[PDB]
Design an enzyme around this catalytic site. Sequence first.
Site, PDB file in Angstrom:
ATOM      1  N   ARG A  68       0.817  -1.207   0.000  1.00 37.17           N
ATOM      2  CA  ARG A  68       0.000   0.000   0.000  1.00 37.17           C
ATOM      3  C   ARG A  68       0.853   1.260   0.000  1.00 37.17           C
ATOM      4  O   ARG A  68       0.816   2.050  -0.948  1.00 37.17           O
ATOM      5  CB  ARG A  68      -0.925  -0.009   1.213  1.00 37.17           C
TER       6      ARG A  68
HETATM    7  N1  ADP Z   1     -12.129   0.310  -3.034  1.00 39.96           N
HETATM    8  C1  ADP Z   1     -10.971  -0.385  -3.055  1.00 39.96           C
HETATM    9  N2  ADP Z   1     -10.210  -0.451  -4.167  1.00 39.96           N
HETATM   10  C2  ADP Z   1      -9.058  -1.144  -4.189  1.00 39.96           C
HETATM   11  N3  ADP Z   1      -8.565  -1.814  -3.133  1.00 39.96           N
HETATM   12  C3  ADP Z   1      -9.228  -1.830  -1.958  1.00 39.96           C
HETATM   13  C4  ADP Z   1     -10.495  -1.098  -1.853  1.00 39.96           C
HETATM   14  N4  ADP Z   1     -10.941  -1.269  -0.601  1.00 39.96           N
HETATM   15  C5  ADP Z   1     -10.036  -2.044   0.043  1.00 39.96           C
HETATM   16  N5  ADP Z   1      -9.014  -2.375  -0.763  1.00 39.96           N
HETATM   17  C6  ADP Z   1      -7.863  -3.217  -0.373  1.00 39.96           C
HETATM   18  O1  ADP Z   1      -8.195  -3.902   0.828  1.00 39.96           O
HETATM   19  C7  ADP Z   1      -7.187  -3.749   1.822  1.00 39.96           C
HETATM   20  C8  ADP Z   1      -7.833  -3.300   3.122  1.00 39.96           C
HETATM   21  O2  ADP Z   1      -6.838  -2.911   4.053  1.00 39.96           O
HETATM   22  P1  ADP Z   1      -7.156  -1.753   5.114  1.00 39.96           P
HETATM   23  O3  ADP Z   1      -8.521  -1.202   4.818  1.00 39.96           O
HETATM   24  O4  ADP Z   1      -5.994  -0.799   5.070  1.00 39.96           O
HETATM   25  O5  ADP Z   1      -7.141  -2.447   6.564  1.00 39.96           O
HETATM   26  P2  ADP Z   1      -8.158  -3.579   7.074  1.00 39.96           P
HETATM   27  O6  ADP Z   1      -7.348  -4.847   7.112  1.00 39.96           O
HETATM   28  O7  ADP Z   1      -8.555  -3.056   8.428  1.00 39.96           O
HETATM   29  O8  ADP Z   1      -9.273  -3.620   6.068  1.00 39.96           O
HETATM   30  C9  ADP Z   1      -6.213  -2.714   1.315  1.00 39.96           C
HETATM   31  O9  ADP Z   1      -4.934  -3.323   1.206  1.00 39.96           O
HETATM   32  C10 ADP Z   1      -6.675  -2.338  -0.069  1.00 39.96           C
HETATM   33  O10 ADP Z   1      -5.634  -2.631  -0.999  1.00 39.96           O
END
Ligand code: ADP
Lengths: 466, 187, 501
Positions: free
Chosen positions: C372
């Site tokens: 990320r």
């Molecule tokens: N709308 C989106 N578009 C692309 N990737 C997403 C989207 N929503 C979530 N992700 C992916 O899902 C993962 C969620 O991680 P994050 O939200 O940072 O923590 P958690 O493990 O608490 O969900 C991220 O690595 C992201 O790459």
Amino acid sequence: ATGRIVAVIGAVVDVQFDEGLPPILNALEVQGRETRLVLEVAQHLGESTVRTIAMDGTEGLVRGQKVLDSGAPIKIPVGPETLGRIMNVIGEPIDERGPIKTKQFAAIHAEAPEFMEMSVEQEILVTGIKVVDLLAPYAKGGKIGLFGGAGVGKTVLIMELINNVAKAHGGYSVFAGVGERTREGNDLYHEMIESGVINLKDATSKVALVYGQMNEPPGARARVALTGLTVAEYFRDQEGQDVLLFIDNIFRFTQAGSEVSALLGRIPSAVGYQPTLATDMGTMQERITTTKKGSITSVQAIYVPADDLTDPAPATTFAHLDATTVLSRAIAELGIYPAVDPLDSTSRIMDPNIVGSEHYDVARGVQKILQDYKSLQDIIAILGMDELSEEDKLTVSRARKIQRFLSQPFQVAEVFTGHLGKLVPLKETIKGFQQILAGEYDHLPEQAFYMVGPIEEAVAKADKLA
Amino acid sequence: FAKLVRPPVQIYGIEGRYATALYSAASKQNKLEQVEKELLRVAQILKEPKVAASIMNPYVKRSVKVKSLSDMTAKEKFSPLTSNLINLLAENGRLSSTPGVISAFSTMMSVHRGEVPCSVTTASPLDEATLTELKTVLKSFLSKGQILKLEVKVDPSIMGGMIVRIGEKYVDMSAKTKIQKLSRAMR
Amino acid sequence: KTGTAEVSSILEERILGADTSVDLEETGRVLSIGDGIARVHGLRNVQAEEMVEFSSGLKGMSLNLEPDNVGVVVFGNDKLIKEGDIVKRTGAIVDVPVGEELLGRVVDALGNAIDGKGPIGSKTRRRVGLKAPGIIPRISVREPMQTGIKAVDSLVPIGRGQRELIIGDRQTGKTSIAIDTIINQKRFNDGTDEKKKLYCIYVAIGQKRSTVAQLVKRLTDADAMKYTIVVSATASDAAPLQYLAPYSGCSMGEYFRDNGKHALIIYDDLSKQAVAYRQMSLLLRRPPGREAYPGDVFYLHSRLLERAAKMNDAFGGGSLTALPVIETQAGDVSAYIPTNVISITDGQIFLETELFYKGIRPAINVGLSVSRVGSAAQTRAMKQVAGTMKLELAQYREVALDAATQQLLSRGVRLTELLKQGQYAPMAIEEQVAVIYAGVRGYLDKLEPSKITKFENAFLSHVISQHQALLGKIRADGKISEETDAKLKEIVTNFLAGFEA
Ligand SMILES: Nc1ncnc2c1ncn2[C@@H]1O[C@H](COP(=O)(O)OP(=O)(O)O)[C@@H](O)[C@H]1O
Ligand SMILES: Nc1ncnc2c1ncn2[C@@H]1O[C@H](COP(=O)(O)OP(=O)(O)OP(=O)(O)O)[C@@H](O)[C@H]1O
Ligand SMILES: [Mg+2]
Ligand SMILES: [Mg+2]
């Protein structure tokens, strides 16, 4: 009253007094340390002896050290001067900008509102996301859950709800970080400065921040959700305003009570948690209410451990919510973001009176064509597609476009894929699910419905793959 | 650590741990008879309603129950090692079990000259010639140069016989010779 | 209610006069031993988490203070200890020797040499139980940390200060990613630009002792043991020595971070640490949870991986990058431990055991590998080319004689074979950007798939020689301009006319 430390077992310190036994939930002060170690009385063991829980690291405590009673529970600075600042568990500034100057102080452990103060108003909080507008709409002044595993999007979604709802809000905001990445809490403080929400020159800031992160001891993660709550009780009661209350993550309040419950000498209940698991969550969660003075709109984010929704920690917080958005990983593998389960998301205001008779009828047709597709997946996987009926090659061929039409490109995920963030109105996510359930778009492929905004861009994408 | 002398009985419990630790300090320095005469008078001066109160009463303190006992054992007769024993019982909260430590110590000191007395439980007490004859054949059985003590109990449930125990021996001549008539049935 | 120190050997010290020739303030005895911890009587001035010393020469940590006794966690074996010993108080929290003078040694977890080269010569000692920096001193990552692997540096880019997982099954190529990171820093540590230097630390937990020994040769064979430390607690060491191995390993990297230098640490692996913390917990009779683990496993790995951060320019400007390793049982990325560490680190790298069998090596799952925060910190030369290969590797994955299918199934196999890489061959940054250039600009679309591993080894071996002075402007200027890509068009299309098919 002064006492002597008698036993130090991990993050639980024992103290014997000689006169003046302090009552429960009082704070104590340890004498003879460079920083400020503050305890919290939790039991009375008899023989003039209490048992405390420490709010920092207990490395370097000698059996015989002196501790001084404060005479009152933990009181933090509260008011409009705490806006635009960062506070830790015991209300000290951790942003190197000087002390927080207020006039009044409020204790941490306060009681719940009574029966005759509960307001029964119900409204709708339109967000801009197609999945949570249609199938599980959000109410102003009520609690909102966000369930999910580890890696599905419980924080890319909660930073989108800040971008849409909280930026155009007129009231105040409170963020409370309980057990998340400390590099994420630095990014939130450094995005609100550039977007002008927190201002460091004048007095027009709109959001306070409270932080106890994952590198903190268990005694300091079990009490930081009460601190970000007590800040948002002044802005409701003694000012009469409409606040927002983002908490993330609330499972760490439950996890960090089980780490210290073994050291307090208890018999443990089911899968490993404390016995008083649902007694002290209801004591915390019934202080986040919309009363007859103001409106607290809490948007929580709950963690599901090992993807098990029958675990007692994410299955006792289901009785405290109005909306519910259950995220899943099996939808996120296919590339459908946000990976919201359509058949598991519930809502309380979903009723034909409040949201209407036209919103309620399209939203129930979507849950009907997606359930009949779910009952044919045991046959399509074995006997293939050529063994169905002719009318059941239309439930499949239509549910595989509604599934892709519940995908949306978010605004905070511009740095992931490089696509533009799209927002839709509520009146246009009703029109998009009528021209699919009727059969107006039975001459387009499924991949033309993938990652768009409203229904007009779907026909502006199918002309490309011609 | 140092070694400690073993008592000839070796009882167990929270009261045997305090009757052994005193026997390992009073067999050293040859004071096993001075403590015994003191311990049979500290049993008397505890069971007074001024002093039996506020030792089992839990709401006083630990330290002021020591000072009300640190001068009581100092003024009257005692300044041996045994004054540390009452000082140690009041620190550990074990002041309630002080008759348990004293009563254990008498039998642990008994066996230094005692014989683990007998039990003849047959009937009404008989004449003198039957008593002196059993007291002069049981003296031939000990073979340890120790003047045996004895108790007599009355139990009429045994028909015409008597049971006799010598320590842990327990010969038997009683109504169980009527229960040995199952050889007429079980054969 | 019988008391630990109600035994007759301690009542006798009190009942025979309060004895004077026993210290009972800085030294105590040992009442019992055998389950790990020891029950030490006395030591009335000990602190919490303070190292003590036994009479046999073993260090021990003061874990649990009670009104009767002290419970000392014993480092090393517990056969050497006997009931009735005497234990001395050092007077300091558990700390390890640390400094610049450790680069080139092989120590154990307590900071003693086991390579047989004499003492270490250290002057400063830092604790192992320090806290992570707060919210103010950190800042977002901006400098890139090169790997030398063509699949990692162009698809999941890393940056100086970003945690990154390496997760897979057994024998999938986990350690061989971590070795090529250490050998690739040879080009930077032997230069004049001090701002790009980078050290290394390796922590070996629960491994075999004969696999670490065949690893320090491979680093010495490539001139890579002059900037690398190795901490080692192998599988024959005791259980407290594997638990405290990454803490002493990270405290040697916190020295460089606070003094303007950049560090790198590879924990290998964090799976065998959590089965060592499980053993010490259940031997203390603690309530187990999921998979018989204790309740505070999340405190074990979060308080360790929160230290790897990047300070701001007012604090020196250093950094600390971590790369932990987790081993899963048959692709189980939904278990208790591989989800407690996905919810900490800033991305993943997945190694499939069913692409390692098909001959694709390194078997990197490109679909499930994400990074990320480290995407914004990479070279603009790499972002100008690898931003295109991200698109075609996506369009190859949906189609798994038709129109618009046999075009992407042609290119999408030539890019999969372009991302294979031999062992121990770390490539430079500007040599990658020419090989990924030929595969995404449409030059090798005509060749056969089996003759493309032959093509990369022939094109690189010549442009490194006849166009060496013309390749340096990619690495110096840091980008592909309008004069370089017009020049790069002629280098490839003249080589394909000379490359015999
Ligand atoms: N709308 C989106 N578009 C692309 N990737 C997403 C989207 N929503 C979530 N992700 C992916 O899902 C993962 C969620 O991680 P994050 O939200 O940072 O923590 P958690 O493990 O608490 O969900 C991220 O690595 C992201 O790459
Ligand atoms: N790029 C590559 N090309 C060819 N072979 C490779 C490559 N990478 C690794 N291997 C082979 O894989 C084998 C095992 O690699 P490695 O030691 O990294 O596995 P591992 O996962 O560390 O094993 P374990 O964790 O069980 O010790 C090595 O012997 C090596 O020959
Ligand atoms: Mg998150
Ligand atoms: Mg390995």
